[PDB]
DNA sequence: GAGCCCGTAATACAACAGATTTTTTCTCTTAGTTTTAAATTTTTATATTTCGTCGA
DNA sequence: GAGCCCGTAATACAACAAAATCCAACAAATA
DNA sequence: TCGACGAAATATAAAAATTTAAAACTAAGAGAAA
DNA sequence: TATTTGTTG
DNA sequence: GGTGTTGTATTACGGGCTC
DNA sequence: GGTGTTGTATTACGGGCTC
């Protein structure tokens, strides 16, 4: 840079004296040089692949003791294209090409000496974002989930749009005092200066004031009436629907487990509005590691581990939810949207398998499992095996057909088949749709299977489950419906 | 625990399945499908009193048949 | 300086500092239990496999 | 050399090294 | 040495009816190791 | 007079 | 692939004075 | 009155040679 000939009267050639042993005219009063050489050379380094008339050794120049002031002066003088900028950016750009043993001390010494030459007069005593304005929200209905945990607190950052699902103990017992403890338990990130939770008027924020007076933070948790201009209410509305979808799943190994994965996936998806994903809207790094290795079960020391990891790859469900609700299509095209179906793929058929009856306040929408298609009659009559061919129990119209039963990666569990299968897999359920109107048969959603598939239960194996909550939620769904 | 007892049985099934596959020369995904069929068989109250080689041979055959291949039952029964 | 051999001889560095049971999960090993399905018979027409024998 | 003030600023030195039961046995405290 | 036939082995769906494993499933018992 | 309970190699 | 690591009194080294 | 202390590899310093 400044010169191609190094000054030998410094520590550079004395470090170069590691194994080549050129010459030793170190310096006047060189007590520091030889101890530095022996210590920082014999112990660990063994670096500096020696070169003739070069100081490249790493990929950074080893600037001499005599030359450092001149190169820093040429690097800092704004008239000489140096900028006279801050310490951090100059320190960053000064060491991809320069080594400078004890670079930081030299930089801070030069800054504290040259500050008299160029004084800075920023005001010391007496504007939003990054954990300054924060808002937390509650959820309404939620199952007890094996430990009486029926609460979820989402805490939405007003600026970074980052959420945190916490306070999963109780609906009222963790609402007076322990909500302060939970805000304190994720407040190790920081203490926000304003909280605008906007749920209800509370006796809380008086004990919150007590903690922030026991400490020195000037925080406030007023939340007078509401912040509602255009979007934060929309953010609350779209947030709770996903949490109600978590409510609509996972009745064992419940949402109180694997909720951090849900938070990671939510803050990992790009917003597509005004920017990028929450882990890079304020943090700027950390790729999500999307691969979870949902394969190689034959090479596995713990098969429960690979089963739960295959469950962990259910992030596709969340991404599909937030993509389809990011949530419409072209009108009047849906009549022509059924297309030509090739022979071989599994076909899902509607309620009228062989009997069409008055299903129990029907929200299942196709009501049975898939079958295989072997032949087609016309454009509106397809043959696929359901029952024996007596009284034409083989062909139905295309209005009673669908297409898609795929992605076993997102849905690990298979289709249960027998009652003795059902007895053992009974304690893995998601939802209950409605009793079959014929005599007594139950229709249910199982866990880790796609919602299009359905599994039939009778009263024989229905007595070995937590089914109290199942017909409870069916009763309140009926109350909502009628 | 209830989940603890499953792991030893699955490990024994994997060991026997790999032992037969070492002589059958079948690819990895066929063995993976065979092991998931063995998991389904245990979920269906797996047939007790049967010989161990019979059920693993059935699972290996149905896995090798679910994708069009060439293995024959004599190769399963060649000891 | 500059190093080397070798023969003595100093030289900081660390062990003696009460020792043992528990505490909380986990992971092979090895013996006892439980549910369940299977070894020899009738049998009935069907069909293909594999011996087994016979013939010119 | 010779020392001093003062202001930073390096500098070996040790703590995290699982936690907590007693063992055997002196002498205080009642009842 | 190609043709000609006999014949047990299976499925098969029941009712059955004594013995034989037999492999999931518990449960000590040791051995780790912060 | 037996059963305790402080502290210490 | 896998193998120390910072908190802390304590102490050493430059600007400015006497030379 | 009463309060560290040696065993041990490891390494540093003189006679005798080359200078």
Swiss-Prot record, chain A:
Positions of Mg(2+) 3 binding: 137, 198
Swiss-Prot/TrEMBL site (Cleavage) positions: 9-10
Annotated stretches, region: Integrase-type zinc finger-like: 78-117
Domain Integrase catalytic: from-to ranges: 127-286
Domain of life of the native organism: Eukaryota
Stated name of the protein: Integrase p58
Organism in which the protein naturally occurs: Saccharomyces cerevisiae (strain ATCC 204508 / S288c)
Upper lineage: Eukaryota, Fungi, Dikarya, Ascomycota, Saccharomycotina
UniProtKB/Swiss-Prot annotation, chain B:
Compartments it resides in: Nucleus
Sequence repeats mapped onto the chain: 20-79
Additional record remark: Present with 4330 molecules/cell in log phase SD medium.
Main function: General activator of RNA polymerase III transcription. Interacts with TBP. Binds to Pol III subunit C34 and to the TAU135 component of TFIIIC.
Family per record: Belongs to the TFIIB family.
Oligomeric form and interacting partners: TFIIIB comprises the TATA-binding protein (TBP), the B-related factor (BRF) and the B' component (TFC5).
Name recorded for this polypeptide: Transcription factor IIIB 70 kDa subunit
Residues of the full protein shown: 71 to 149 of 596
């Amino acid at each position: 840079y400044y010169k191609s000939d190094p000054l030998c009267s410094a520590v550079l050639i004395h470090m170069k004296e590691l194994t080549q042993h050129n010459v030793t005219p170190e310096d006047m009063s060189a007590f520091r040089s030889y101890q530095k050489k022996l210590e920082l050379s014999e112990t660990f380094r063994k670096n500096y692949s020696l070169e003739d008339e070069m100081i490249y050794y790493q990929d950074r120049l080893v600037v001499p003791i005599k030359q450092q002031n001149a190169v820093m002066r040429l690097y800092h003088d704004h008239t000489l294209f140096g900028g006279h900028f801050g310490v951090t950016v100059t320190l960053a750009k000064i060491s991809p090409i320069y080594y400078w043993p004890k670079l930081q001390h030299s930089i801070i010494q030069y800054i504290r000496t040259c500050v008299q030459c160029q004084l800075i007069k920023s005001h010391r005593p007496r504007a939003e974002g990054r954990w300054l304005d924060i808002s937390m929200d509650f959820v309404t209905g939620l199952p007890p989930t094996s430990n009486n945990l029926n609460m979820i607190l989402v805490v939405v950052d007003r600026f970074s749009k980052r959420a945190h699902f916490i306070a999963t103990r109780k609906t009222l017992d963790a609402t007076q005092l322990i909500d302060l403890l939970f805000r304190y338990i994720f407040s190790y990130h920081g203490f926000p200066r304003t909280i605008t939770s906007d749920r209800d008027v509370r006796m809380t924020a008086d004990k919150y004031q007590e903690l922030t007076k026991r400490l020195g933070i000037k925080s406030t948790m007023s939340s007078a009436n509401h912040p509602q201009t255009d979007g934060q209410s929309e953010r609350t509305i779209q947030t709770l629907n996903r949490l109600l979808r978590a409510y609509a799943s996972t009745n064992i190994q419940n949402w109180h487990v694997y909720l951090p994965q849900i938070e990671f996936v939510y803050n990992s998806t790009p917003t597509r509005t005004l920017g990028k994903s929450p882990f890079e809207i304020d943090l700027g790094y950390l790729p999500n590691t999307p691969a979870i290795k949902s394969d190689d079960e034959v090479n596995a020391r713990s098969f429960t581990a690979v089963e739960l990891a295959k469950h962990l790859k259910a992030l596709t469900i969340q991404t599909k939810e937030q993509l389809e609700h990011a949530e419409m299509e072209t009108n009047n095209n849906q009549r022509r949207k059924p297309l030509l179906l090739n022979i071989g793929d599994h076909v899902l058929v509607h309620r009228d398998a062989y009997f069409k009856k008055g299903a129990y306040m029907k929200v299942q929408q196709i009501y049975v499992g898939p079958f295989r298609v072997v032949k087609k009659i016309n454009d509106n009559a397809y043959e696929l095996d359901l029952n024996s061919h007596k009284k034409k129990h083989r062909v139905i119209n295309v209005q009673f057909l669908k297409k898609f039963v795929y992605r076993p990666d997102a849905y690990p569990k298979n289709k249960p088949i027998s009652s003795t299968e059902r007895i053992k897999r009974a304690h893995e359920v998601t939802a209950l749709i409605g009793i079959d109107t014929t005599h007594k048969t139950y229709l249910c959603h199982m866990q880790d299977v796609d919602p299009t598939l359905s599994v039939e239960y009778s009263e024989a194996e229905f007595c070995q489950i937590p089914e109290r909550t199942r017909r409870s939620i069916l009763a309140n769904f009926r109350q909502l419906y009628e | 625990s209830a989940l603890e007892s499953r792991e030893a049985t699955l490990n024994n099934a994997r060991r026997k399945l790999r032992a037969v596959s070492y002589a059958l020369h079948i690819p990895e995904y066929i063995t993976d499908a065979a092991f998931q069929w063995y998991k389904l068989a245990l979920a269906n109250n797996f047939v007790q009193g049967r010989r161990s080689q019979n059920v693993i041979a059935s699972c290996l055959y149905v896995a090798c048949r679910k994708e069009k291949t060439h293995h024959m039952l004599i190769d399963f029964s060649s000891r």
